[PDB]
Amino acid sequence: AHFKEYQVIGRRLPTESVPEPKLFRMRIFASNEVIAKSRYWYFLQKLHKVKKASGEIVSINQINEAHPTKVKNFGVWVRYDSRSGTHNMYKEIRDVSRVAAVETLYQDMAARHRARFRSIHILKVAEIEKTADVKRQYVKQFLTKDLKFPLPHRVQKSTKTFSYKRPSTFY
């Protein structure tokens, strides 16, 4: 769905031999609360000798980013499964918030490489703090000085089925 960024912190269950576990933390992009907890258990089992039954979640806190109005340019690294192998990737999405960038990435992967939600790992999402540190052309294009372009051939949507004059696409 529309994504939200949560932080999930979990740990192994305390015991007499080893109390005070390490309290691992991980940032998850998910539609709702239940998925964020699930994806944390999914990914944590891939690093440490732990699972849902042998540990606990201590906290979850949704992270909404500082500047929902300033336009960023995000460098994103992923790890996804094709029909034949597993491949890493790096791209940019230029948009207004971190979550909308991930929401673009999932659609972008699903459109170009037919990668569904299950077969995608989001490695890290970072802002490119410096212009001219952009290496892909499709986002480097919009960074020129005094950028301006028209929108030719505008198509009006008609409410009534019949129009009494031929439409014009000026804009």
């Binding site: 089925t161 439409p167 696409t169």
Partner: protein, 197 residues
Amino acid sequence: VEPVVVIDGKGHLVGRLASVVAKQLLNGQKIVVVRAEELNISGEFFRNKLKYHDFLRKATAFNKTRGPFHFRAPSRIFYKALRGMVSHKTARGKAALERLKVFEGIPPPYDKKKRVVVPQALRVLRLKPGRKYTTLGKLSTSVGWKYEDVVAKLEAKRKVSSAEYYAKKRAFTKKVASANATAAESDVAKQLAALGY
């Protein structure tokens, strides 16, 4: 909101126009389509010519007379598309098709009546720029239609008399527009403008 709706078919997609019109008849609306020869089908002319030839080889093996009929007129090609979007085999479906007339060019009395368009079927609004499209008049001629030259001649004549009608119309509407401007800034007009008129 209309007894009879006459559609300028030029610059329309045959399938989207057929769908829009088919619904209109099933809802009780009488439709007349004119200028079928200027209808468009999306796809390069070679693509649409092959499709008709693949259609042309389907016939009843043991008697070609009772087989499918391959109608070659631009009006008939549009009619075939519309008949498939209607349950033409039932009494209600036959009643619907009685509310339809498809013409080639703009014949009499429909030549002096208003023509409308269907924007959701119009080619300049539907198709992406650069996409290749076919014109039904050209496609019909390649498969056996005989009256491209007849229709073009009769539309050259019709448009000349139509431009004569419009030139007089523009002269009269200038004369009326001047009168309304003079009759403006009057106390009656001021009160009308206050009410939105």
